Amino acid sequence: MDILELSERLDLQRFHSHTLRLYRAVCALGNNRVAHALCSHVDQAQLLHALEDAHLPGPLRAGYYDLLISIHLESACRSRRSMLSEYIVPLTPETRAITLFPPGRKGGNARRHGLPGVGVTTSLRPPHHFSPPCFVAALPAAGVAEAPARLSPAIPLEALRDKALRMLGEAVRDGGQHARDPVGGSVEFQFVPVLKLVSTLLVMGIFGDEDVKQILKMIEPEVFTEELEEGLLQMKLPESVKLQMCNLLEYFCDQELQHRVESLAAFAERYVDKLQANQRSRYALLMRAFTMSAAETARRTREFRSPPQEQINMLLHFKDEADEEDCPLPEDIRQDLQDFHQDLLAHCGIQLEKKPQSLQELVSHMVVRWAQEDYVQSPELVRAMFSLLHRQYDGLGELLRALPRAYTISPSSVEDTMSLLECLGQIRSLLIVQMGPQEENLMIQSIGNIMNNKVFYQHPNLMRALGMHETVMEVMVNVLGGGETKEIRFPKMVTSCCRFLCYFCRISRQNQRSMFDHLSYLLENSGIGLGMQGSTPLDVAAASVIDNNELALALQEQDLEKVVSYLAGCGLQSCPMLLAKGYPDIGWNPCGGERYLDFLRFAVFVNGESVEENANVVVRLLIRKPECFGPALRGEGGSGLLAAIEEAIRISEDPARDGPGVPPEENRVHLGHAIMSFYAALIDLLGRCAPEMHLIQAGKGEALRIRAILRSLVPLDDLVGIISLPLQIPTLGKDGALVQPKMSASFVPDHKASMVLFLDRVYGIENQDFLLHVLDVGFLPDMRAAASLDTATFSTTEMALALNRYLCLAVLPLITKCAP
């Protein structure tokens, strides 16, 4: 039956309009795989004819217009829209041609305001991706989670924009007649779908310069002159279309904001050339200033011995005219900047007749007229109206809040910048979709493209301005939230993004400092993160405070309290991850304990010097929690520190106890080695938080108290025994087969390194008796073991290299310090 009969058959109309709502539902939020499938049921011909079909009912007409936007335009529009808030302006010759005002002769301060959305914009927005929807093409060889991401179905946008422009003009002319049969059955059903299409195309930038000129003519034919016929702002429209009107004006106000930012970037390009030329010339005249001056030249060379950040501040520090002495710029340059500030405020309408004569005054008058005409009942319309009104009055404010997201880049890196922005758009588009394996591989390959992208290192300030770290952490919150209790699903993306965050912190101090504000946020989410191996979220937390003294000082006390309480639970409960694979049950988790201890080590150790404020806080918590030290050092029913080592070596040597007994999996946990390494991590923490020599010599009360308490905890004999432990040296046998023991299941010098550093920082060497008493049993076998392994074959093995780094980090600096 003819679809126009649904205007009377209201039983079918509700169902079919809801069917079109399901068609939008199955293709909403970038499901372009299904959006390609919808091109079979509703192809391009039906949609285009349904646009111009003037006798279609209300809900059906808006259903097909929204369906067309959802299918062909939503995915591209949303991704572009998310990039409208960023202005990465390259320095190009046509970028230079961008001016705040069009050429004119109306006045020196400011000519007539230019047409919004008309001209050239050089801000980098990635091009849209479209694919022609074809169903007879062969099925891809690659399946799900390996095939490239599907692109949006194609549609001729050059013809579509002409159709939208023509029908919008038709609707304007038809509305002027005030006919009793508006298209679609009502004024709202006549104007809302087409204004939605116009707004979506405007956001995507499909419309050309003349197309924008036409749209401005239909909005207001007299205000937007270039040098019934009534505009869309004088039609007494319902509230529903007023919202789309606000969206239209919002786009133009974004164009004005982008135009101001681009003009500022072009002015930066013009001004830096003269600034650097003048400063360079003054450099030469300062070199010859010694011919007519004396030692007072520090007042002139302070600029050259100061880094450029405050140099430009001193150069530009002449606005109020009471500070011209520190500015060496000649008055022609100062006049140039003061002139550009004058038409900058004129372009913002700060200062310097019913005709609005401009977009800002037109929008302001239009909004206040709408508000005073009738009591607006739509809260969304009210919020949109006042958002536009506030943006017209606070012209400087929107520029002020837009500058932190602005950035200027060299033209030689645009090809990598667009690829980076495309990857960023992929990550942003994945924030609104549930976890999926195909969705999992998309950011992993995008992140790998970010790593391989050189701009990620060349311009980390731009990386922070775009703020990818917030998006990545939000992805972490999403994946950790899903399955927050039973199991953290999809670990492959978890380690990839946490690797990215760790790689992000090490780029620069400011990036690390910015990431540091999410420490508590990360720490709460790290409670269930112990079920993950590799690049754990705790590693991101640890790398957030690495080698940064100021951040270590500013790190809060309850963050360490929470970490120690988690370590307490590690020391009193078994690992659910270990029990999952079938590891035999013991009362504590050494691997999780070591993971917590490594962050504790980074919390109190900075550049070789312990942080006393962090140190006394963390150690006090260890003192208050006696169980954190492990099965040994417990006190009540406890065993010696040395005593737990022989049983740990027994577990490592004898199988079916070191693991499940069913590396073989390349990350197989060795229970004996883990127990044998937890003690090393704990003791290394205790050694690295020890009070410094100058504090002990100064005799601070808490410094001596902490050292005496720590010395009381660990007896000196247990140290000598662990240091005196023989090494499983790789010997040669069975026809030159180098029998190298498993490095994750044998006595490695890593455990002894914490022993020697512990004694050196805490106990120290006082007399010769104690020195030789530890030397003969503990470092003497090590030195002969290294001498025995020093040959053309064994020296390349890991154990000999481990001894090589050993002697020179633990024994030899101790011997050198204790030489006399």
Binding site: R280, S364, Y375, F386, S387
Partner: protein, 375 residues
């Protein structure tokens, strides 16, 4: 490094433009002053060309400012667990707050003119429901400190300046008929969450200042980044200023309301809770003084810390004075049986040793006179 580092003319053009932009905005955009709040509120507050009909009903549909206030009251009254930050509300609360105050033997005549113009500025708002809007947003914030409640308190102060009697009457009537407990639950929560002076934070700040952090692309000299001591001092001062403005003018009806609420099913005694905060402040002042007791001279950062801590204590004392003046016998009995005396003793002990400590040096006269007017 400074003497052997890269001169300005050798910087890349794009990098050189990058910090030029942030320098230009910091030196020419922040410094630029544009006064548009008064004319924008005037435009929103003027009823334009619809009263000319003079309809029989006289339904008096809201002018744009009243519609805006109603919209914010609606989103404030939405049943929502967390009050999300609204940049639109933040900018409009700020614009409304900056459009009211507008601020040598000046006479009592033109001073009265300035007063009766200030009440005109406040009348432009409080007759349009902004007074009830502020109360609603304080209750809706649920005691979560933030930049949105700070702008809410700033608006309440700006619409309450000089102790506007009708504004206090409207606020009291709105709390009396709504009978919402959440307004005082949130007020108590915000006041408890207010911070005091911290010795540990001071020592860490002093060490950080000793290190002198610098950037890579250039260098910042003596960076004045966010202080971790008395960060919310401005918010605490605003909160107590708002409380003082509520009872200013000896509004004994509202003074009894703060002490106890007849309408509410549960009573929160703000007066004693204010004393509790004064106690937490007096311990902070005593301990921070004890750190300077050994030291012979007080340095500049410690002087700044005292300047703001004493400014907060001044505001707290002004608020406590405003609770009992009139006199309010209920508040007088409450402070008589409260823990106020220990705070008074602690300040007296701090004061006695403090003035003599600042008396042997002439570089602390500015701080000392702030203690003189505080006591």
């Amino acid at each position: 490094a400074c003497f052997r580092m890269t001169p300005l003319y050798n910087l890349p053009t794009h990098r050189a433009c990058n910090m030029f932009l942030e320098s230009y905005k910091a030196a020419w955009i922040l410094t630029e002053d544009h006064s548009f709040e008064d004319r924008m509120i005037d435009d929103l507050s003027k009823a334009g060309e619809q009263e000319e009909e003079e309809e029989e009903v006289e339904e008096k549909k809201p002018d744009p400012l009243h519609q805006l206030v109603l919209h914010f009251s609606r989103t404030a009254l939405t049943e929502k667990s967390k009050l999300d930050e609204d940049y639109l509300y933040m900018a409009y609360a700020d614009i409304m707050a900056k459009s009211c105050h507008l601020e040598v033997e000046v006479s009592f005549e033109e001073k009265e003119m300035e007063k009766q113009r200030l009440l005109y500025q406040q009348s432009r708002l409080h007759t349009r429901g902004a007074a009830e809007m502020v109360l609603q947003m304080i209750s809706a914030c649920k005691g979560e400190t933030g930049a949105m409640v700070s702008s809410t308190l700033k608006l309440g102060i700006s619409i309450l300046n000089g102790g506007n009697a009708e504004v206090q009457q409207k606020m009291l009537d709105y709390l009396k008929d709504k009978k919402e407990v959440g307004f005082f639950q949130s007020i108590q929560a915000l006041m408890q969450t207010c911070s005091v002076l911290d010795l540990n934070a001071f020592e860490r700040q002093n060490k950080a200042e000793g290190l002198g952090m610098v950037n890579e692309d250039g260098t910042v000299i003596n960076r004045q980044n966010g202080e971790k001591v008395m960060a919310d001092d401005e918010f605490t001062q605003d909160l107590f200023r708002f409380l003082q403005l509520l009872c200013e003018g000896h509004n004994n009806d509202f003074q009894n309301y703060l002490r106890t609420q007849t309408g509410n099913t549960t009573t929160i005694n703000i007066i004693i809770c204010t004393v509790d905060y004064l106690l937490r402040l007096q311990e902070s002042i005593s301990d921070f003084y004890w750190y300077y007791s050994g030291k012979d001279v007080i340095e500049e950062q410690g002087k700044r810390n005292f300047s703001k801590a004493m400014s907060v204590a001044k505001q707290v004392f002004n608020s406590l004075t405003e609770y009992i003046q009139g006199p309010c016998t209920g508040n007088q009995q409450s402070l008589a049986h409260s823990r106020l005396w220990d705070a008074v003793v602690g300040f007296l002990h701090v004061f006695a040793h403090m003035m003599m400590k600042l008396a042997q040096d002439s570089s602390q006269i500015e701080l000392l006179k702030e203690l003189l007017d505080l006591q």
